[PDB]
Amino acid sequence: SQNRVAEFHTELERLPAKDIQTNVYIKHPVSLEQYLMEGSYNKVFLAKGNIPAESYTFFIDILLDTIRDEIAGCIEKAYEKILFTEATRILFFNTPKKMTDYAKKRGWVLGPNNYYSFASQQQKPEDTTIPSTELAKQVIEYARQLEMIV
Amino acid sequence: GLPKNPDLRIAQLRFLLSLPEHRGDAAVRDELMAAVRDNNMAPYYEALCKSLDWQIDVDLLNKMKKANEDELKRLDEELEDAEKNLGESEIRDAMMAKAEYLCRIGDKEGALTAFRKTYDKTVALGHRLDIVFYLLRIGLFYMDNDLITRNTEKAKSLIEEGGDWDRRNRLKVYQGLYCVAIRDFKQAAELFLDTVSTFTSYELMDYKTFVTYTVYVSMIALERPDLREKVIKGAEILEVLHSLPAVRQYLFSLYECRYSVFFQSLAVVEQEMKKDWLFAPHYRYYVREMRIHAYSQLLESYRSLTLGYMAEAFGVGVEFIDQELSRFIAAGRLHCKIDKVNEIVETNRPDSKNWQYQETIKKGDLLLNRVQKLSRVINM
Amino acid sequence: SGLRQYYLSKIEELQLIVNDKSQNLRRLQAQRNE
Amino acid sequence: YLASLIRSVVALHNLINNKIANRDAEKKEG
Amino acid sequence: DDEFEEFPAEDWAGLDEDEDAHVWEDNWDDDNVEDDFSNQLRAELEKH
Amino acid sequence: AAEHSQRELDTVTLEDIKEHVKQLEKAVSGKEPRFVLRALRMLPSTSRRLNHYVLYKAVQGFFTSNNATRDFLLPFLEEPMDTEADLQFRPRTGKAASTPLLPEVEAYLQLLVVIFMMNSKRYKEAQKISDDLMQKISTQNRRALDLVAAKCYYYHARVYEFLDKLDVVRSFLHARLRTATLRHDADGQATLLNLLLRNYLHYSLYDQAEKLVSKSVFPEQANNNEWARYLYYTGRIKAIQLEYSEARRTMTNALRKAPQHTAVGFKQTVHKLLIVVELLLGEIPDRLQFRQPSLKRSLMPYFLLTQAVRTGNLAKFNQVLDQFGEKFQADGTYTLIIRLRHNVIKTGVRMISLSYSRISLADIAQKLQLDSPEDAEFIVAKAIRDGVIEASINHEKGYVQSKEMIDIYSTREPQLAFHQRISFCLDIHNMSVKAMRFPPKS
Amino acid sequence: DKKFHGILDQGEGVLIIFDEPPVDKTYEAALETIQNMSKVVDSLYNKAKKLT
C-alpha cells in the first residue's frame, strides 16, 4: 500500500515456500500483488470482500488510494487527451464529482467535462545548439594523451 | 556410372513405408517385396519385418537364406583359390566381389568391414576413390552421419592429392546432396548449379530429379539477380524443364511475380517435400522461408499497400495474410509495420547509414572485449 | 609502543610509492638509452 | 576510433613480444 | 584458471539418451505447430 | 605396478612445489608483488593431483626450522607406509635450512595443507588449521603475504561453508574488509567484497547486501574472476528487487567476463538467471544456447518454460512449473518464475506493438484472448507507463498508436559512444607500454 | 530489378521519385578492418599460450 514494491519482494524472499501457496493469511498480499502486476484493477478492487483478518481492513483503504494514484499516473504518462470512457468510469468512483478534488491535486488542465490534458508531449525537445566547448576539450585531450610520454 | 548399390530407391521406399499414411499401400509394399526377392537381402528382410511387425514368409525366407549361403560360400571359395596362387588383382577382384555382395544383400557391418579390407589392400587411387564413393553411398543408405563426414574428408584428401576430375565432380554432387540433407541450403544451391552441366552420378538420382532439387534450393539460397543469371536463363535448366511443367511454372511464377500461381505451386511443393526422404526433415522451414522471401519481394517496391491488395495479389483472404505477416514480423525477419484501423502495410525498411553504425558498434564491442581480456590475461 | 604503528603504515605507503616509481624510472631510462 | 583500435592492438602485440623475449631470456639464463 | 568448483554442475542421474540429436540450426519457429500449409490454402479456397 | 608411476608423480610434484616456493622468494626479494600471482595460478591443478606422500615430504623438507607450526602440521599428516627408498627431500640447504622461512612461503604451505584437508571429507581438522592460518596472517603484515592472503580468505570461506557455519564468520570478514580498504589492496578488497556478498546470499538477506553494495566501491583493478563474482552477485540482488534491466546488463557483462573453458557450473548459473530475467522483461532469449553441449541438459526446464511463454498457455505453464517445481526451487529462482507467471501477457503486448503501428483496442482484446477490451486497455496503458513499449493511447477513436522511429545518427549519441571507446583504447595503449620492463641489466 | 529509383503507393495511386546513395564505402572498409583485426587478436591469443 506504500508503493514500495522493491521492499515487498525483498521481504517475500525471507519466508519459506510452503506458507506462500498454502497459508490463506499470507495468500492475500501475494495474490493482490499478482493481480496488480497483471494490470487487473477491477479484480483487486472487487477482491476487498474476501479478507483473511479484520485487522487488515484499515490498510485495504490505503492500498486502494495507492492504486488510485497509480492509475492516475498510468493515465497521465499514457494516453493522449483523456477519454478512457470517462474518468469516473475507470477511476471506480461511486459519484462523478468524487474525482474533481483528485484532479485538482494533480496538474491537470481540467478541460471540457471528463476531458483533461496530460501534456504527454513533454515539450517535445527539439532545440539543438551544438555544444562546442565540451567537444573542443575532448579533442584536445585526445591530442594530449596521444603526444605525451607514457 | 557406378553400380546402383545400395539402390537409394530402396531408402526412398523404406521411408515411404515409414509414414503412417503410406504404411498400407499395396502397390508400394509389393514393389519393395519384389525388390527384396530380386536381390535377396536376408538381413534387410529381417530388419524390415522387425520394424514393421510384418509376418515372416518362412517358406520364402528358407530359400532366401539357402541362396544367400550358397553365394557367400562361393565367393569365399573364389577368394581362397585366388589367394592360394594368384597375387593381387584376382585376390582384390574377389575381395571387391565380397564387399559388393555384402552391401547388396544389405548387411551393413559385413559390407562395411569388407570395403575397409578392400581399401587397405587397394593402392589404386581410382580404386581408392571407387571404394570411398561406395562407403559414402552406404553411409547415405543408413544416414550414418559420422561415417558420411569421415568418408567425405577422406575423399577430399585423396582428391587433393590429385585425381581424375570426373570423380571430383562426383564428390561435388555427393557434398551437395549432403548439404541439402543437413539444411545448409546455400552450399547445396551453389554446388548443384555449378555441376548442372556435369551430373555423372546417376546412381544417386535421375537428372530430372537433380535439376528439381537444384531449382528448389536455388530459389531459396540465391537472390533475384543471380537467380535470373543462372536459373531462368540457363540453357540446361530450360532444356530439361520442357518435361516438368510444374517446376517450371513454380519458378517462373515467383520470378515474374505471378504470386497467386506461385502460392498454388508452393502448396504442392510442400507435399513433394513431405513425401521425400532427403527434404522431409526441412519441409516446414523451406516453405516458410520461401513465404518470407515472396512477402519481401512484393513489398520491395511499394511504400504502402492495402491488405486487400495483398490478398487479391495472393488470392488469399485478409485475416490469413495479416496473421502470417504479424507472425513473421515477430520472428524479426520482415521490414514493415501493419496498420489495422486502415488496412495499410507502410514500409519501415531501415536506413543504410544507421545500419552500418549499429553493426560497427556491435562488432567493435566484441573486439574490445577480446582485447581487454587479452591484455589482462598476460599477467593473470 | 609509542606511535610506531603510524610511522610504520606511513613508511609502508612511501615504500610502495617509491618502488613503483623506481620501476617506472627504470623503464624510462631503458627507452632513453635505446 | 578505428585508428585507436589499430594502435592498441599493435602496442599489445609489442608487450607480448617483450614478455616472451624476457621469459626466454630468463629460461635460458636459469 | 580459477575453476568455480564452488558452483556445482548438473547431476547426471537420469542422463537420458538424445531423442534425435539433430544439429542443423534449431531455430525458434520449429517448435510451433502449424496446419500443413497446403491444408490451410485448401480450406481458404473452400471458404473463398 | 602403478605404485612406481605414483612415485614418479610425487617426485615431479615435489620439484614443482620447489619451483613455486622459488617464485615466491623471488617476488618477496624483488619488490614485485605481482610475481607471486605466477605462483598462484596452478593451485587447482596441484590440488586435483596432490597426495599424502608429497605433502609429508614437502612439510618435512621445507620446515627445517622446526617450529610449533611443524608440530601442528605433521600430526595430521599420515606417515609413509614403511618407506625405504626415501630420498629425504631437502629443499633448504645449509643457510637456507637454518634461516627462518619467509612469511609468504609459509602461508603458501599452509594453503596447500588446508586444500589437501579439504579434498578429503575431513572438515574439522581443516577448519582448525584454517583458523590457525587466519591468526597467523592477521598477526603479520606484508604485501606478497597479502596476495596469498586473498586466496587464504577464499579457502577460509570455503571451509566455513562446508561446515555450514557461514554466519559466525561475518564479523571476521567485515573487519578484514575494513583493514584491507584502509591499507589499499586491490585483489584482497575484491575477494572480501565477493565473500561478503556470498555470505549475505546464503541466508537470502538481500536488503543488507543492497546497502553494502550501494555503499562500498569495487576497485577497478581485479581479476576476470573476481569481477565475474561481483557482477553475478549484484545482478542477483537487483533481479530479486525490481530493476530488471540493470540486472540483465550486469549479468551479460559477467557471462562475458568469465573464464572460457572452466566454470561449467558458473555458466549454468548465470545463463539460467539470465533466461529468467529476460523472460521477466518481455523479450525472448535466443535459442542458440539451449543446444550448446555444456548447457543442453541443464536448461531443459527453461527450454520448456520459454516454449510456454511464447505461445502463452497457462495450462502448459502450470504443467511445466508443477512438474519441474522442486528443481526451480533448488536453483534459487522460484520466486522470479512466479513473478513471470502473472506477466505472460507482456510478451504478447510487446509483440503487438512491434508488429502494428496502430491497432484498435478491440483488436487487441481479440488477439490476447482477454475479456472486455477495457482489460487490454488498462494493460497497455500500464505497459507504456513501465517503458517496455513506446506509444500513445487515444480512445476517442479507440486505437493505441505506436511512436515513429527517430534518427539516432543525426543526434549526438554516435559522438559520445565513439569518444568512450576511443578513451578505452588509448588507456589500453598506455597500460600496455607501461607494462614493459627492460631488465637486460637485471 | 533496380531499373530506377523510387517506390509506388498503392491505394493513393502515387509514384515517388528520389535519389539514394545506398552505401557509403567508408563504413564498409571499417567493418572489414574490424573483422581482420579480430582475426589478428585470435592469432595473438593463439600466440599468448607460449607465455604460460
Side-chain angles (χ1 to χ4, degrees), chain C residues 2-34:
Chain C
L3 259 167
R4 269 199 59 220
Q5 310 309 338
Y6 148 86
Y7 273 45
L8 259 282
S9 79
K10 160 183 304 297
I11 275 159
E12 286 321 278
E13 268 299 89
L14 284 175
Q15 194 67 13
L16 182 45
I17 295 178
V18 164
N19 292 0
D20 171 30
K21 207 161 282 312
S22 295
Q23 199 183 173
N24 217 73
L25 171 57
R26 214 153 291 132
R27 172 186 72 76
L28 220 53
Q29 284 187 350
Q31 281 190 339
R32 166 263 176 197
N33 273 318
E34 175 201 281

Side-chain angles (χ1 to χ4, degrees), chain F residues 10-30:
Chain F
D10 298 8
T11 53
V12 59
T13 57
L14 248 193
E15 176 56 283
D16 165 288
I17 302 145
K18 171 82 238 171
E19 295 315 318
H20 307 171
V21 55
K22 290 308 310 190
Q23 294 297 339
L24 277 176
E25 195 289 326
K26 297 295 153 292
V28 169
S29 34

Side-chain angles (χ1 to χ4, degrees), chain F residues 329-432:
Chain F
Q329 177 63 343
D331 302 291
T333 281
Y334 179 101
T335 57
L336 304 154
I337 174 174
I338 307 309
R339 277 222 293 253
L340 204 82
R341 180 170 55 182
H342 299 269
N343 278 63
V344 64
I345 213 161
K346 189 26 39 185
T347 303
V349 172
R350 254 291 300 271
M351 258 314 322
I352 272 155
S353 149
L354 281 196
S355 161
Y356 301 86
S357 162
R358 151 170 65 200
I359 209 182
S360 98
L361 290 151
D363 306 354
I364 279 196
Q366 196 274 352
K367 199 172 306 313
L368 292 179
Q369 290 71 58
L370 296 202
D371 311 352
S372 96
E374 277 55 8
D375 319 78
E377 211 286 329
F378 254 126
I379 209 73
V380 169
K382 199 215 157 182
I384 166 178
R385 195 224 59 73
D386 272 9
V388 170
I389 287 152
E390 311 290 55
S392 100
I393 303 158
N394 155 22
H395 158 239
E396 42 181 290
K397 301 307 308 201
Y399 66 71
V400 179
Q401 157 135 20
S402 79
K403 299 287 189 67
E404 85 311 341
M405 157 301 294
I406 48 170
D407 171 8
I408 195 184
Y409 194 44
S410 289
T411 41
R412 213 156 62 98
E413 173 60 23
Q415 198 281 334
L416 283 164
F418 290 134
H419 154 84
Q420 253 188 10
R421 283 141 187 71
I422 287 149
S423 207
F424 174 37
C425 299
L426 303 160
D427 299 312
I428 292 165
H429 163 99
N430 282 356
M431 272 167 228
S432 288

Side-chain angles (χ1 to χ4, degrees), chain B residues 13-29 271 274-275 283, chain E residues 36:
Chain B
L13 320 154
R14 215 221 71 71
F15 192 71
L16 243 194
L17 276 315
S18 156
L19 263 300
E21 289 58 5
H22 320 72
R23 81 174 47 266
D25 315 297
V28 194
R29 164 166 197 178
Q271 304 304 119
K274 186 214 274 275
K275 300 187 315 135
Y283 100 93
Chain E
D36 301 353

Side-chain angles (χ1 to χ4, degrees), chain F residues 145-162:
Chain F
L145 195 47
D146 183 35
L147 282 168
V148 300
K151 209 79 81 188
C152 328
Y153 318 102
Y154 174 59
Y155 279 110
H156 181 106
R158 276 231 69 204
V159 86
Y160 264 50
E161 166 176 290
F162 252 128

Side-chain angles (χ1 to χ4, degrees), chain E residues 26-42:
Chain E
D26 309 308
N27 157 67
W28 263 133
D29 283 328
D30 288 33
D31 280 292
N32 313 71
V33 315
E34 313 196 342
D35 198 342
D36 301 353
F37 170 41
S38 97
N39 156 256
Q40 338 175 12
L41 218 77
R42 166 143 44 70

Side-chain angles (χ1 to χ4, degrees), chain B residues 27-57:
Chain B
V28 194
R29 164 166 197 178
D30 155 50
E31 146 69 71
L32 196 47
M33 308 336 297
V36 202
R37 189 191 336 285
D38 282 293
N39 236 338
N40 286 359
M41 305 103 53
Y44 201 73
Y45 210 137
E46 284 177 6
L48 198 169
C49 271
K50 164 282 191 173
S51 198
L52 277 67
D53 298 0
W54 272 4
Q55 295 192 3
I56 293 148
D57 188 296

